[PDB]
Amino acid sequence: SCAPTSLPASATELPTTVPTGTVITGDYTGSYRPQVHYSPPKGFMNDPNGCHRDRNGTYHLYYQYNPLEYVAGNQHWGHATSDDLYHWTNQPIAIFPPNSTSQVFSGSAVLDPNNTSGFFPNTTDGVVAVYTLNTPTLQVQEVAYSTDGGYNFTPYENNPVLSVGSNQFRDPKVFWYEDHWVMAVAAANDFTIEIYTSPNLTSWTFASNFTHHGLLGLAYECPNLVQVPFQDDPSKSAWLMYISINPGAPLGGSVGQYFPGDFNGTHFVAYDSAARIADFAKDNYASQWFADTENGESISIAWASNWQYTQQVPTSAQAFRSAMSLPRRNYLTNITRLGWDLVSLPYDLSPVVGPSLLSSSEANSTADVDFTNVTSNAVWFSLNVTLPDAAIQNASLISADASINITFLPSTKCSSSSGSGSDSPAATLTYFYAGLTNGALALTRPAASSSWGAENPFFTDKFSYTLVDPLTSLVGVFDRSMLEVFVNEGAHSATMLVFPDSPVGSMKVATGGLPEGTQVNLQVNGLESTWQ
Amino acid sequence: SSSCAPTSLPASATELPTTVPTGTVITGDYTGSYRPQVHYSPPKGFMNDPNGCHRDRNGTYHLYYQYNPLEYVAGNQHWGHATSDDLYHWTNQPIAIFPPNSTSQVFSGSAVLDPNNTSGFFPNTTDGVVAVYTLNTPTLQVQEVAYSTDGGYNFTPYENNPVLSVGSNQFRDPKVFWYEDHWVMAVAAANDFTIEIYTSPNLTSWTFASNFTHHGLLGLAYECPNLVQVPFQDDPSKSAWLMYISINPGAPLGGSVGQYFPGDFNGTHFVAYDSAARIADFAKDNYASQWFADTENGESISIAWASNWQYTQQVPTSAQAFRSAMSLPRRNYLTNITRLGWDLVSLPYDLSPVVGPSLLSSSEANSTADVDFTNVTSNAVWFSLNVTLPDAAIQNASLISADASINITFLPSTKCSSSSGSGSDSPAATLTYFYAGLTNGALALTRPAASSSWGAENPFFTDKFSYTLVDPLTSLVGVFDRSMLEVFVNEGAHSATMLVFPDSPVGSMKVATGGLPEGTQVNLQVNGLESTWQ
Ligand SMILES: *[C@@H]1O[C@H](CO)[C@@H](O[C@@H]2O[C@H](CO)[C@@H](O[C@@H]3O[C@H](CO)[C@@H](O)[C@H](O)[C@@H]3O)[C@H](O)[C@H]2NC(C)=O)[C@H](O)[C@H]1NC(C)=O
Ligand SMILES: *[C@@H]1O[C@H](CO)[C@@H](O[C@@H]2O[C@H](CO)[C@@H](O[C@@H]3O[C@H](CO)[C@@H](O)[C@H](O)[C@@H]3O)[C@H](O)[C@H]2NC(C)=O)[C@H](O)[C@H]1NC(C)=O
Ligand SMILES: *[C@@H]1O[C@H](CO)[C@@H](O[C@@H]2O[C@H](CO)[C@@H](O)[C@H](O)[C@H]2NC(C)=O)[C@H](O)[C@H]1NC(C)=O
Ligand SMILES: *[C@@H]1O[C@H](CO)[C@@H](O[C@@H]2O[C@H](CO)[C@@H](O)[C@H](O)[C@H]2NC(C)=O)[C@H](O)[C@H]1NC(C)=O
Ligand SMILES: *[C@@H]1O[C@H](CO)[C@@H](O)[C@H](O)[C@H]1NC(C)=O
Ligand SMILES: *[C@@H]1O[C@H](CO)[C@@H](O)[C@H](O)[C@H]1NC(C)=O
Ligand SMILES: *[C@@H]1O[C@H](CO)[C@@H](O)[C@H](O)[C@H]1NC(C)=O
Ligand SMILES: *[C@@H]1O[C@H](CO)[C@@H](O)[C@H](O)[C@H]1NC(C)=O
Ligand SMILES: *[C@@H]1O[C@H](CO)[C@@H](O)[C@H](O)[C@H]1NC(C)=O
Ligand SMILES: *[C@@H]1O[C@H](CO)[C@@H](O)[C@H](O)[C@H]1NC(C)=O
Ligand SMILES: *[C@@H]1O[C@H](CO)[C@@H](O)[C@H](O)[C@H]1NC(C)=O
Ligand SMILES: *[C@@H]1O[C@H](CO)[C@@H](O)[C@H](O)[C@H]1NC(C)=O
Ligand SMILES: *[C@@H]1O[C@H](CO)[C@@H](O)[C@H](O)[C@H]1NC(C)=O
Ligand SMILES: *[C@@H]1O[C@H](CO)[C@@H](O)[C@H](O)[C@H]1NC(C)=O
Ligand SMILES: *[C@@H]1O[C@H](CO)[C@@H](O)[C@H](O)[C@H]1NC(C)=O
Ligand SMILES: *[C@@H]1O[C@H](CO)[C@@H](O)[C@H](O)[C@H]1NC(C)=O
Ligand SMILES: *[C@@H]1O[C@H](CO)[C@@H](O)[C@H](O)[C@H]1NC(C)=O
Ligand SMILES: *[C@@H]1O[C@H](CO)[C@@H](O)[C@H](O)[C@H]1NC(C)=O
Ligand SMILES: *[C@H]1O[C@H](CO)[C@@H](O)[C@H](O)[C@@H]1O
Ligand SMILES: *[C@H]1O[C@H](CO)[C@@H](O)[C@H](O)[C@@H]1O
Ligand SMILES: *[C@H]1O[C@H](CO)[C@@H](O)[C@H](O)[C@@H]1O
Ligand SMILES: *[C@H]1O[C@H](CO)[C@@H](O)[C@H](O)[C@@H]1O
Ligand SMILES: *[C@H]1O[C@H](CO)[C@@H](O)[C@H](O)[C@@H]1O
Ligand SMILES: *[C@H]1O[C@H](CO)[C@@H](O)[C@H](O)[C@@H]1O
Ligand SMILES: *[C@H]1O[C@H](CO)[C@@H](O)[C@H](O)[C@@H]1O
Ligand SMILES: *[C@H]1O[C@H](CO)[C@@H](O)[C@H](O)[C@@H]1O
Ligand SMILES: *[C@H]1O[C@H](CO)[C@@H](O)[C@H](O)[C@@H]1O
């Protein structure tokens, strides 16, 4: 059969009061509902919050949650748990505002195993949440603590723990550094990340400012100050300041940027004055790193949307708005010429990988992969290309036509008669080894595939990144309404929402003009739903 | 007389010579349905970066440009030359600078007047022009000098060229200017993401002064640096220095883009006021901006190449005898905008010489004005929309309806299009702005894929661009010129250059406002523009 395109009113109707102590029940069957990404059971989700791995290995994801509407507001912290970052268990709402005229904005969570806070005299797995409380006139930082492993939180009796008398002061990311707690918090409309320190998470002292770096956009948000291992040597690492900006991103709306540098417990110093954008498309925002991971592990997740159209995407009839990105493992590397680069790769996908749909070593060919049998409507693919040494040593031996095309094509079996009726691909990827646009990689969601997408004036159709080195590896995940691509071992990555009128039913992978002796290896797998 | 511009031209108008003409102006047919009528485009062939931009002592503006006279793609670079007194009415001139042989190219550079004969080239004239440009060879990029004594038409190479080599193949686009007591060159160490600053007493001996490295967006290369002094918009007695750098490829929208840095320059060092990156244009088709040398005091005048390296060599205009047009000429200022602070202002240079008949004037709020310009033979229009919100709405924006918006749509001609079936009526370009609601301050500029078979199929021809204001939109000015739309927001605070290649020519425009607060004043003015070629 075919995934429903709209759900019964009982699956999409939202409560008039926020459920306390109860898990919100969700129908995850909609034709747009991602099957291996997190999305809330009902309602509207945005930024990931309080991300941490507990001592039993369970990942806790919290998130900005409107349980009452399909648009942003009434923010609570939703909560889901996973042991593998793919199979999620919805949990009751973790943090509630004190009244209907306040909202629980973004923040972070840490384990306090040594009871620095004083909240945990008889436990070693105390969790402290540090979050922004939004009121009509102020944004302040507050603490709440959990003794049950991060399910139920109690507000700190002397909240707030930090106010500067500002209405633009939010998204505290807290972490342990040697002998004290560090908070990175956004003085959002001043384009400043403020660094504060604390011995106990409740009394905070100003250390330093990081101001007017990289792209300003209209606000700094969701700062993450994290230590990231080197891809080619995970014994080595550097600090990275990751800043989300919204609005005012170059593609429009929201985007993440980063700065490699040094951190010494009080001051972050960037290695240079350059601006670096994390993702070359527009649906990757508010990346948050999981606290309490071990040495050599950098784990993050982002909200896979854009503030310019997140509240207008056509999924509310399927009981949700917004999904998280694939969970990510991060590295730092140097790429040819450009130097510093934030590597993003999908966190181990093995737990959701299903049957092989195609395995091919054919070069200069077109492989058609039908996945109308894959009930998840989600696929993974990996394409490796190894050029002959002669082509690496002399690039003038590569034909101008040497290229790769990947197209995701609409289902004939589950086609909508109401949409475009187009045979337009839902999504395309094009790369040129040489010619006039040498190294250029285009990722597109053709307007002709989506009535909604064509009409939305911010739903940009085409994205590109230009490689210096030849493309040697490409990995992708398509999950009903999302495509993520990872180029050259995660050197470059892009997160793109797609809302085709007809569900994707097949994909074509074409290579052509590749030099004599070029090795091509393609693998495609159906993914297994984590919700069904 | 024709009723519709030709979409394809006779082979005589498009066929390119097999040898580069010397001493002769290349003849051009400027009638194609995509040929801009108030922007500069080469008579035939392929153009890119503006070069050697300067005003001579007679008040004549000289535009040079990267020129392939032999193909409709980049290569065989010479300097083309056109002159104007007003930066709208252009006169094509013979090719100004030629490579020494068939295996070298004249890459980008700048030109200056040397009235005091610092160079030694001009013992008997105060009208000497010196061009400083990159010579590209298979293995090297070096800086060379050439001088003109006839007012910038014919150049002679300096006998001891090159004037500057560092043994690099990525070393180009020198912009030279006078600072107090010496010449300054800003030149790109392109693949090192460094602008090198050299000084010279005479334009032929250059000394290294300082580096400006790894600032703003890196892209894949730094190109065409401009280090210029720009007056304050609200106070012409004040100014600051600006480092303007083009990057290609690797721009965030894909391909090529311009960025800038406000700062201080003292003759040897440029120091940015902060570590922020600032993008000049919020669309895709504005690159290699160059400032005119030797303007009057307090006039900052620039022009850019209105294209993108990802599709400039593939745009469907070669059948109309050209590839590439320059942007409108721009008057530049610096200002502070709400919250963001420093901002490069770009406004169209005085358009009065090309303004034709008024097509529409409206004071109506919450209405739709339909403007037919099928009778405007230039197929080019200017519009200005002013909006004055009531003070109550300025002081408290929660008083503005979520519906408060402006929509501008450019619609295909019924008079010059006989096309039928799906997509036939798609707008060629749209502009949408919201005062409030979920995307408050958001301005979208789009070129619908459905309007252009070529644009839909090109994988780099991005359909939608946006910029988000902090302040309400109070002014919007635009020029549509056959195949180009440029928009200027809030007195040139924000600007965008966007190419459009609709299957049918544009014949009409709709301007709609809705949901505007009670007592909002709106003024809309639209004029046909007069062709500068015809
Ligand atoms: C993947 O899709 C792209 C289109 O997005 C294909 O690229 C295009 O390929 C053709 C064939 O090489 C190009 O045509 C050629 O034009 C040049 C002149 O520019 C000519 O010298 C060649 O003989 C040929 O006729 C076309 O320009 C090009 N389009 C773009 C936008 O670059 C690509 O071939 C596809 N690759 C595969 C493996 O399917
Ligand atoms: C001012 O900036 C210029 C341009 O960045 C500097 O010259 C450049 O210096 C670097 C470092 O010495 C050179 O990079 C290196 O190149 C060699 C050759 O391929 C390579 O073996 C090394 O691994 C390294 O990447 C670069 O070639 C060179 N570029 C140019 C155009 O000369 C210059 O040193 C700076 N001067 C000062 C005083 O800061
Ligand atoms: C650190 O950064 C903050 C934020 O930019 C600075 O505080 C701001 O200071 C300016 C100038 O007085 C005020 O106009 C803003 O309203 C303040 N913003 C906030 C969030 O308070 C602070 O002065 C900086 N401190 C240091 C030591 O540089
Ligand atoms: C201009 O066009 C836009 C659509 O692009 C109109 O926007 C919609 O406005 C209503 C409120 O009036 C919202 O509820 C919709 O969500 C908006 N659409 C989008 C895509 O955001 C806008 O009203 C139009 N304005 C005028 C003056 O015609
Ligand atoms: C709601 O709580 C916030 C602090 O949490 C307080 O500032 C505000 O006054 C409260 N509002 C009402 C209506 O009680
Ligand atoms: C809790 O810790 C206190 C010290 O603060 C100690 O006296 C007591 O034995 C502990 N109680 C339990 C149940 O472990
Ligand atoms: C981890 O498991 C232990 C033993 O089963 C249990 O006591 C503890 O509560 C668990 N911790 C968390 C954070 O769930
Ligand atoms: C945290 O440390 C500060 C500074 O010593 C102290 O004043 C404050 O009381 C501490 N808070 C708690 C809850 O221990
Ligand atoms: C951190 O480094 C800064 C210089 O960037 C220095 O001023 C400060 O004292 C250092 N702090 C510590 C804790 O070493
Ligand atoms: C990248 O190269 C720089 C030298 O330019 C070096 O200092 C840094 O450690 C390198 N980083 C990685 C991740 O290899
Ligand atoms: C691919 O096709 C190119 C272009 O026709 C040809 O030169 C080459 O032999 C082919 N290479 C492979 C690996 O099949
Ligand atoms: C591509 O290469 C990577 C690393 O060498 C490997 O893990 C992967 O299985 C390869 N994929 C294919 C389709 O051969
Ligand atoms: C062309 O002129 C350049 C610059 O003088 C020189 O380097 C190059 O060798 C010349 N090429 C030939 C083929 O003469
Ligand atoms: C330019 O000035 C330098 C330094 O005084 C001098 O050596 C050089 O000969 C001059 N060049 C000419 C062409 O006069
Ligand atoms: C220009 O300023 C720099 C510092 O920014 C200084 O080192 C240099 O001496 C100055 N040069 C002149 C000519 O004043
Ligand atoms: C912008 O504001 C800064 C700080 O007040 C000031 O130094 C600068 O001169 C201003 N620039 C303009 C163009 O008004
Ligand atoms: C425009 O219409 C809105 C209702 O949509 C109304 O509130 C407003 O008063 C009108 N404004 C003007 C200037 O007529
Ligand atoms: C808008 O006002 C400006 C001056 O503020 C004026 O130059 C322009 O002609 C006006 N345009 C309209 C639409 O009234
Ligand atoms: C969801 O859209 C589908 C199109 O496949 C319809 O069949 C259904 O009625 C609902 O509108
Ligand atoms: C979504 O809307 C469709 C209308 O076709 C129904 O099929 C479904 O029950 C739900 O209301
Ligand atoms: C509300 O009712 C619908 C059917 O109309 C069910 O799908 C759902 O489980 C709930 O009972
Ligand atoms: C649940 O909510 C959805 C989205 O608003 C509706 O389409 C449905 O009928 C029910 O109200
Ligand atoms: C669930 O119930 C608790 C009980 O006090 C409320 O505080 C909460 O807002 C929600 O309604
Ligand atoms: C969570 O909400 C459910 C709704 O039925 C209750 O059963 C529970 O007591 C808690 O309020
Ligand atoms: C230019 O394009 C137009 C499209 O209608 C044709 O009429 C003409 O013959 C030429 O192809
Ligand atoms: C433009 O179209 C004409 C035919 O109308 C041709 O002569 C020319 O080669 C180009 O295709
Ligand atoms: C002149 O050039 C144009 C573009 O290639 C052709 O359409 C025409 O036939 C002639 O070759």
Short mmCIF file of N, CA and C in Angstrom, two decimals, chain A residues 189 191 212-218 247 250-252 272-277 307-308 311-312 337-338 432 436-437 440 442 444 453-454 456-462 464 466-468, chain B residues 191 193 214-220 249 252-254 274-279 310 313-314 339-340 434 438-439 442-444 446 455-456 458-464 466 468-470:
data_model
loop_
_atom_site.label_atom_id
_atom_site.label_comp_id
_atom_site.label_asym_id
_atom_site.label_seq_id
_atom_site.Cartn_x
_atom_site.Cartn_y
_atom_site.Cartn_z
N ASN A 189 21.81 39.80 20.13
CA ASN A 189 21.70 40.97 19.21
C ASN A 189 22.94 41.85 19.32
N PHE A 191 25.89 40.21 18.91
CA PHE A 191 26.82 39.33 18.17
C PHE A 191 28.02 39.03 19.07
N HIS A 212 31.65 39.74 17.30
CA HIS A 212 31.72 40.23 15.89
C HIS A 212 32.69 39.36 15.10
N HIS A 213 32.50 38.05 15.17
CA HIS A 213 33.31 37.08 14.41
C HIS A 213 32.44 36.44 13.36
N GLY A 214 33.05 36.16 12.22
CA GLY A 214 32.40 35.49 11.09
C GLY A 214 31.20 36.27 10.62
N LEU A 215 30.21 35.55 10.12
CA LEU A 215 28.96 36.13 9.62
C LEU A 215 28.11 36.57 10.81
N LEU A 216 27.55 37.77 10.75
CA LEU A 216 26.75 38.29 11.88
C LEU A 216 25.33 37.74 11.79
N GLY A 217 24.79 37.65 10.58
CA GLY A 217 23.34 37.48 10.42
C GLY A 217 22.63 38.55 11.24
N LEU A 218 21.51 38.20 11.85
CA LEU A 218 20.74 39.16 12.67
C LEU A 218 20.90 38.83 14.16
N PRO A 247 17.83 35.66 11.92
CA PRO A 247 17.94 35.42 10.48
C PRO A 247 19.28 35.91 9.90
N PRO A 250 23.37 33.68 4.63
CA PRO A 250 23.50 34.00 3.20
C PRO A 250 22.46 33.33 2.29
N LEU A 251 22.09 32.07 2.56
CA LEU A 251 21.04 31.38 1.75
C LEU A 251 19.66 31.84 2.20
N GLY A 252 19.61 32.70 3.21
CA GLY A 252 18.35 33.16 3.79
C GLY A 252 18.07 32.42 5.06
N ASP A 272 42.28 32.19 13.26
CA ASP A 272 42.37 33.24 12.23
C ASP A 272 41.05 34.02 12.23
N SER A 273 40.88 34.93 11.28
CA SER A 273 39.72 35.84 11.25
C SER A 273 38.68 35.36 10.22
N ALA A 274 38.76 34.11 9.74
CA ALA A 274 37.90 33.67 8.62
C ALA A 274 36.53 33.23 9.14
N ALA A 275 35.53 33.31 8.27
CA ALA A 275 34.18 32.77 8.52
C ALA A 275 34.06 31.43 7.79
N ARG A 276 33.51 30.42 8.46
CA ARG A 276 33.39 29.05 7.89
C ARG A 276 31.99 28.53 8.14
N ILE A 277 31.29 28.14 7.08
CA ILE A 277 29.88 27.66 7.15
C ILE A 277 29.90 26.13 7.18
N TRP A 307 14.34 28.57 9.73
CA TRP A 307 13.33 29.48 10.32
C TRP A 307 12.49 30.20 9.25
N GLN A 308 12.94 30.30 8.00
CA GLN A 308 12.13 31.03 6.99
C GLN A 308 10.89 30.23 6.59
N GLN A 311 7.80 26.82 10.03
CA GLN A 311 6.43 26.89 10.58
C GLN A 311 5.37 26.74 9.47
N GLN A 312 5.77 26.60 8.19
CA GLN A 312 4.85 26.56 7.02
C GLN A 312 4.99 25.23 6.25
N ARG A 337 43.99 23.38 0.11
CA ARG A 337 43.97 24.85 -0.08
C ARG A 337 43.19 25.55 1.05
N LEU A 338 41.94 25.18 1.30
CA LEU A 338 41.04 25.93 2.22
C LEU A 338 41.50 25.73 3.67
N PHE A 432 30.76 17.63 -11.40
CA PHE A 432 31.66 17.66 -12.57
C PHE A 432 33.11 17.53 -12.12
N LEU A 436 33.89 23.43 -17.53
CA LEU A 436 33.83 24.88 -17.19
C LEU A 436 33.49 25.06 -15.70
N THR A 437 32.77 24.13 -15.09
CA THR A 437 32.42 24.17 -13.65
C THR A 437 33.13 23.01 -12.94
N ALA A 440 32.51 21.47 -9.20
CA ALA A 440 31.21 22.00 -8.74
C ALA A 440 30.24 20.84 -8.47
N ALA A 442 26.30 20.26 -7.29
CA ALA A 442 24.97 20.87 -7.16
C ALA A 442 24.05 19.86 -6.49
N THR A 444 19.94 19.74 -5.52
CA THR A 444 18.72 20.48 -5.88
C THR A 444 17.49 19.70 -5.44
N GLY A 453 6.59 23.72 -2.36
CA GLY A 453 7.97 24.23 -2.42
C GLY A 453 8.11 25.30 -3.48
N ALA A 454 7.48 25.11 -4.64
CA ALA A 454 7.53 26.10 -5.73
C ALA A 454 6.95 27.43 -5.25
N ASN A 456 6.44 28.52 -2.02
CA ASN A 456 7.08 29.16 -0.84
C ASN A 456 8.25 30.00 -1.35
N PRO A 457 8.26 31.32 -1.08
CA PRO A 457 9.29 32.19 -1.66
C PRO A 457 10.68 32.03 -1.02
N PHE A 458 10.79 31.32 0.11
CA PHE A 458 12.10 31.11 0.79
C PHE A 458 12.65 29.69 0.57
N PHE A 459 11.87 28.80 -0.06
CA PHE A 459 12.22 27.38 -0.23
C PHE A 459 13.14 27.27 -1.43
N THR A 460 14.40 27.67 -1.22
CA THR A 460 15.45 27.72 -2.25
C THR A 460 15.58 26.33 -2.89
N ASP A 461 15.75 26.29 -4.21
CA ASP A 461 15.71 25.03 -4.99
C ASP A 461 17.11 24.44 -5.16
N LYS A 462 18.16 25.25 -5.20
CA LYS A 462 19.48 24.75 -5.65
C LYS A 462 20.59 25.24 -4.73
N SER A 464 25.02 24.51 -3.83
CA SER A 464 26.26 23.98 -4.42
C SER A 464 27.43 24.18 -3.47
N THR A 466 31.86 23.73 -4.14
CA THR A 466 32.89 23.44 -5.15
C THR A 466 34.10 22.81 -4.47
N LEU A 467 34.44 21.60 -4.89
CA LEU A 467 35.60 20.85 -4.37
C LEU A 467 36.85 21.41 -5.03
N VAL A 468 37.98 21.31 -4.34
CA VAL A 468 39.32 21.50 -4.96
C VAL A 468 39.81 20.11 -5.37
N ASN B 191 45.21 31.95 -4.06
CA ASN B 191 44.97 30.62 -3.45
C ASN B 191 45.55 30.55 -2.04
N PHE B 193 44.58 33.07 0.02
CA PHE B 193 43.56 33.93 0.68
C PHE B 193 44.27 35.10 1.37
N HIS B 214 43.31 35.58 5.33
CA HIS B 214 42.31 34.70 5.98
C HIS B 214 41.26 35.54 6.72
N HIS B 215 40.68 36.52 6.03
CA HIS B 215 39.57 37.33 6.57
C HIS B 215 38.28 36.95 5.85
N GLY B 216 37.19 37.02 6.58
CA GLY B 216 35.83 36.77 6.07
C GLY B 216 35.72 35.39 5.48
N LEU B 217 34.87 35.27 4.46
CA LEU B 217 34.68 34.00 3.73
C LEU B 217 35.87 33.74 2.82
N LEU B 218 36.42 32.53 2.86
CA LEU B 218 37.61 32.19 2.04
C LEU B 218 37.16 31.84 0.62
N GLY B 219 36.02 31.16 0.47
CA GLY B 219 35.71 30.53 -0.82
C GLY B 219 36.90 29.69 -1.27
N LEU B 220 37.18 29.68 -2.57
CA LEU B 220 38.33 28.90 -3.11
C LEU B 220 39.45 29.84 -3.51
N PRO B 249 35.78 29.94 -6.76
CA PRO B 249 34.41 29.57 -6.37
C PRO B 249 34.23 29.59 -4.84
N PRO B 252 28.76 31.21 -0.65
CA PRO B 252 27.68 30.46 0.01
C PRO B 252 26.49 30.10 -0.90
N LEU B 253 26.10 31.00 -1.81
CA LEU B 253 25.01 30.72 -2.79
C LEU B 253 25.56 29.86 -3.92
N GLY B 254 26.85 29.59 -3.92
CA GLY B 254 27.51 28.83 -4.98
C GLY B 254 28.24 29.79 -5.89
N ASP B 274 36.75 45.05 12.82
CA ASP B 274 36.37 43.85 13.61
C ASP B 274 36.67 42.63 12.75
N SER B 275 36.31 41.45 13.23
CA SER B 275 36.67 40.17 12.58
C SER B 275 35.46 39.62 11.81
N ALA B 276 34.45 40.43 11.50
CA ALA B 276 33.20 39.91 10.91
C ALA B 276 33.35 39.83 9.38
N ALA B 277 32.60 38.92 8.78
CA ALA B 277 32.42 38.80 7.33
C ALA B 277 31.10 39.48 6.94
N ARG B 278 31.13 40.25 5.86
CA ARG B 278 29.97 41.02 5.35
C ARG B 278 29.88 40.81 3.84
N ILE B 279 28.74 40.32 3.39
CA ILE B 279 28.48 40.04 1.95
C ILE B 279 27.78 41.25 1.34
N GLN B 310 29.40 30.18 -12.07
CA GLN B 310 28.84 28.81 -12.18
C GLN B 310 28.03 28.66 -13.48
N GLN B 313 29.16 31.15 -18.54
CA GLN B 313 29.60 30.66 -19.86
C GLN B 313 28.49 29.82 -20.51
N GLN B 314 27.34 29.63 -19.85
CA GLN B 314 26.23 28.76 -20.31
C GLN B 314 24.94 29.58 -20.47
N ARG B 339 21.21 47.46 14.61
CA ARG B 339 21.77 46.20 15.17
C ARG B 339 23.05 45.76 14.44
N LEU B 340 23.03 45.62 13.11
CA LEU B 340 24.15 45.00 12.35
C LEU B 340 25.34 45.96 12.30
N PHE B 434 7.62 40.88 4.07
CA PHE B 434 6.70 40.83 5.23
C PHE B 434 7.16 41.81 6.30
N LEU B 438 5.30 35.44 10.89
CA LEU B 438 6.28 34.39 11.28
C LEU B 438 7.65 34.69 10.67
N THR B 439 7.71 35.29 9.48
CA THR B 439 8.99 35.63 8.82
C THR B 439 9.08 37.15 8.74
N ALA B 442 11.49 39.61 6.44
CA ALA B 442 12.05 38.73 5.39
C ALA B 442 11.66 39.27 4.00
N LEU B 443 12.66 39.48 3.16
CA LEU B 443 12.48 39.89 1.75
C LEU B 443 12.98 38.75 0.88
N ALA B 444 12.10 38.23 0.02
CA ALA B 444 12.42 37.19 -0.97
C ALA B 444 12.46 37.83 -2.36
N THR B 446 12.95 36.31 -6.27
CA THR B 446 12.92 34.99 -6.94
C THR B 446 12.81 35.15 -8.45
N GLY B 455 16.82 28.01 -17.25
CA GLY B 455 17.10 28.24 -15.82
C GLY B 455 16.72 27.03 -14.97
N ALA B 456 15.60 26.39 -15.28
CA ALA B 456 15.13 25.18 -14.57
C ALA B 456 16.18 24.08 -14.71
N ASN B 458 19.50 24.37 -15.60
CA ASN B 458 20.87 24.65 -15.11
C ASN B 458 20.90 24.36 -13.61
N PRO B 459 21.77 23.44 -13.16
CA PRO B 459 21.79 23.02 -11.76
C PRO B 459 22.33 24.07 -10.78
N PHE B 460 22.95 25.15 -11.26
CA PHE B 460 23.51 26.22 -10.41
C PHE B 460 22.65 27.49 -10.42
N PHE B 461 21.63 27.56 -11.29
CA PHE B 461 20.81 28.77 -11.49
C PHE B 461 19.77 28.82 -10.38
N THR B 462 20.22 29.18 -9.18
CA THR B 462 19.37 29.24 -7.96
C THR B 462 18.15 30.14 -8.22
N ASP B 463 16.99 29.72 -7.73
CA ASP B 463 15.69 30.36 -8.05
C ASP B 463 15.34 31.45 -7.01
N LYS B 464 15.78 31.33 -5.76
CA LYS B 464 15.26 32.17 -4.66
C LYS B 464 16.41 32.69 -3.80
N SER B 466 17.15 35.72 -0.42
CA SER B 466 16.46 36.52 0.62
C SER B 466 17.45 37.33 1.43
N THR B 468 16.96 39.63 5.29
CA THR B 468 16.02 39.96 6.38
C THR B 468 16.39 41.30 6.99
N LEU B 469 15.43 42.23 6.99
CA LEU B 469 15.65 43.56 7.57
C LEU B 469 15.45 43.47 9.08
N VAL B 470 16.05 44.39 9.82
CA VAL B 470 15.68 44.66 11.23
C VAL B 470 14.64 45.78 11.23
#
